[PDB]
């Protein structure tokens, strides 16, 4: 009997930002900017990725769900809404000490790599 | 800078019940019946373990703490309270088709591993 069932990657990361919120640390979120729907500044991107502060005083509106990551934040002053498809989403650790986790790769993040609509119909 | 941080094993444990129940899997704990202050009914423990189903219909009041997973069930239909300290918690897996998580060890775990106090002053 076969199962199907969701992607563990959210779940995984709700429990490490809790954890690493809880001990007080601040949660850094490494993210893929290649993935398609990945909406960021591209200005920060290093090497294809970009590395974000998802601490409760740097983020605004910071919505964790099961198919992406949402926020306001702040680059050079200026307040940016940024999306992140869960696929793109590598890793999340404390700046403090790299205390976190890498993703495990699940298929369906392959799948799902699709470019969304961005402009109204 | 050594920074002092709580076990991360109840964040897991938390992510994959609610990743399993989401899924609409039974979700089974493995317990290590040795652990000090554990109290399940010991004629159902084997080899030292006793898999418990965490479901929401198998549990009465269940908590999943940062310390502790306590709650009522049913045994050959007599409910009973069991008590399960976080260091106790071996694993956790889909009945349906196994997948889930065996927690990696964690020092802490070894020594809080200690006989509490289970009668009164
Ligand atoms: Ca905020
Ligand atoms: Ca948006
Ligand atoms: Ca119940
Ligand atoms: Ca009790």
């Known amino acids: 009997m076969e199962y199907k069932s969701s992607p563990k990657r959210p779940y995984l990361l709700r429990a490490y930002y809790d954890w690493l ?8 979120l490494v993210v893929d900017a290649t993935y398609l729907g990945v909406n960021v500044p591209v ?3 290093k090497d294809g990725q970009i590395v974000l502060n998802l601490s409760a005083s740097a983020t605004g509106n910071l919505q964790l769900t099961n198919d992406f990551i949402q926020f306001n934040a702040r680059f050079k002053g200026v307040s940016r809404e940024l999306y992140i498809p869960m696929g ?3 890793a999340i650790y404390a700046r403090e000490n790299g205390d976190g986790v890498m993703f495990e790769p699940e298929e369906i993040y392959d ?3 699709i470019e969304p609509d961005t402009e109204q119909p």
Chains 1, 2 share one sequence.
């Not at 919120?21 to 850094?28: E, G, L, R």
Request: no cysteine; hydrophobic share 40%.
């Open 111 to 113: 799948e799902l790599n």
């Open 88 to 90: 793109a989403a590598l």
């Open 21 to 28: 919120v809880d001990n007080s640390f601040t949660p850094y």
């Open 43 to 45: 200005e920060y991107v």
